[PDB]
Amino acid sequence: PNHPLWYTLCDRYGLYVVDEANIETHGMVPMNRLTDDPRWLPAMSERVTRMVQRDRNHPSVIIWSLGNESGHGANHDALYRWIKSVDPSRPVQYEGGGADTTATDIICPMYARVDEDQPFPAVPKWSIKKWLSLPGETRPLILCEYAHAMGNSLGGFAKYWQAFRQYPRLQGGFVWDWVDQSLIKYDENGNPWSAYGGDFGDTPNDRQFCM
Amino acid sequence: RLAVMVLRWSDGSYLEDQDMWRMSGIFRDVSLLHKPTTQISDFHVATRFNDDFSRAVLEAEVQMCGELRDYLRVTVSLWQGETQVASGTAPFGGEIIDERGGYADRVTLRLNVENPKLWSAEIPNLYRAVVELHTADGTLIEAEACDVGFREVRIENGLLLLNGKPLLIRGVNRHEHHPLHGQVMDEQTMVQDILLMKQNNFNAVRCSHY
Numbered sequence: 401p402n403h404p405l406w407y408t409l410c411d412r413y414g415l416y417v418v419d420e421a422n423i424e425t426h427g428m429v430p431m432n433r434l435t436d437d438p439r440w441l442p443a444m445s446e447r448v449t450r451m452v453q454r455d456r457n458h459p460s461v462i463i464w465s466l467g468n469e470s471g472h473g474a475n476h477d478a479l480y481r482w483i484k485s486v487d488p489s490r491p492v493q494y495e496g497g498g499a500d501t502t503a504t505d506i507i508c509p510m511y512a513r514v515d516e517d518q519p520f521p522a523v524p525k526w527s528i529k530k531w532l533s534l535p536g537e538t539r540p541l542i543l544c545e546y547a548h549a550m551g552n553s554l555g556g557f558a559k560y561w562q563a564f565r566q567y568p569r570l571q572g573g574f575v576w577d578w579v580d581q582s583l584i585k586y587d588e589n590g591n592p593w594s595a596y597g598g599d600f601g602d603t604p605n606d607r608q609f610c611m
Numbered sequence: 612r613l614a615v616m617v618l619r620w621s622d623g624s625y626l627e628d629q630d631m632w633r634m635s636g637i638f639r640d641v642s643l644l645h646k647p648t649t650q651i652s653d654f655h656v657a658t659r660f661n662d663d664f665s666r667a668v669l670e671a672e673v674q675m676c677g678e679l680r681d682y683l684r685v686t687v688s689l690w691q692g693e694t695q696v697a698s699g700t701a702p703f704g705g706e707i708i709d710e711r712g713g714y715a716d717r718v719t720l721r722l723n724v725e726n727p728k729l730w731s732a733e734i735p736n737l738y739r740a741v742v743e744l745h746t747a748d749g750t751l752i753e754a755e756a757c758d759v760g761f762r763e764v765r766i767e768n769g770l771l772l773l774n775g776k777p778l779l780i781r782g783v784n785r786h787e788h789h790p791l792h793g794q795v796m797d798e799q800t801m802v803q804d805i806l807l808m809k810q811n812n813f814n815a816v817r818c819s820h821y
């Protein structure tokens with residue numbers, strides 16, 4: 401959840417907001433080790449419930465999200481239903497565990513390609529066009545993340561937009577991402593330069609991947 | 612002496628506007644069929660399966676014309692080559708269907724088949740079903756027959772399935788056409804066409820448009 405003023409500005413300037421619980425357990429092995437554990441349900445529940453209680457009156461918030469990259473655990477299903485029960489006014493989405501689980505109203509993959517399948521075991525990323533028409537699938541598809549804009553990037557962006565416009569159930573996505581996470585450091589003369597992972601003696605680190 | 616007056620055009624022509632040569636005549640076989648007074652007038656074969664296709668029930672509905680008699684029976688027998696695999700015998704008289712009773716002139720036979728050999732374009736397994744109309748003590752009145760392929764065609768969850776597996780149709784539309792005989796078909800040409808189709812990896816044909 402963001403700084404409270406963010407929602408007020410989005411209400412007033414006009415932007416649709418996906419408000420997202422502060423839950424990410426990416427580093428766990430496997431990713432849902434905590435989120436499938438009933439011992440972590442209380443802690444997870446507070447990150448979802450207290451977000452809803454705070455932000456539910458904002459018109460800019462149109463979709464609730466259960467967090468990011470925490471696999472798919474039984475705790476997600478429980479909290480999905482909790483939101484559906486207390487706030488029927490907003491769809492709930494969640495990407496973890498293959499982007500189309502029972503804890504999401506919207507197929508919301510990250511970095512699924514337009515035409516090319518990436519058939520990873522258990523959590524494949526289908527071509528977005530193909531994904532829509534998988535047997536039994538009826539939901540809209542909106543990428544929670546696509547077109548990773550790292551450095552000299554955004555090649556193939558037009559291919560996404562051509563597809564979004566042609567397919568009714570392809571309703572767009574959220575680019576990753578808005579602003580480089582570089583930090584300012586100073587040289588011996590006090591001149592500022594843009595720093596990234598590893599520049600603060602921080603180790604281990606993932607270098608320029610924050611930008 | 613038979614006399615047949617064939618009209619090139621009729622009100623039927625309004626429903627026969629296929630994109631093809633418009634021809635006319637007695638262009639398929641003519642034949643004479645002798646049936647007894649007490650006769651098999653119709654029969655339907657159905658095959659139903661369990662979830663893994665390791666068991667089947669062949670259901671054969673048989674209809675008769677002629678005078679109804681208690682001594683009448685139908686036997687449906689099912690053959691794999693020269694081996695009889697199953698058989699059923701019953702007198703006429705279907706189950707009750709409404710307030711006025713059932714079909715006295717019909718009977719349904721049900722044969723169990725364990726581990727049926729399944730029909731597909733990949734392996735065209737066939738059984739022979741013989742439908743015998745006869746008396747209780749075994750005097751044959753008449754027999755009809757057909758080739759039986761054990762297969763289930765269904766649409767589930769948006770997929771067309773044959774025997775529980777999703778088909779990939781490698782098909783072609785095929786008109787009945789010979790450059791010398793027009794729309795008259797012969798066995799040699801039919802067989803030539805089927806061999807060429809299968810040799811070129813086709814598994815399906817659409818009877819365009821009749």
Ligand SMILES: [Mg+2]
Nearest residue numbers: 628629630631
């Ligand atoms: Mg036409």
Ligand code: NA
Nearest residue numbers: 564567568570
């Ligand atoms: Na669209």
Ligand code: NA
Nearest residue numbers: 608609610611
């Ligand atoms: Na990053």
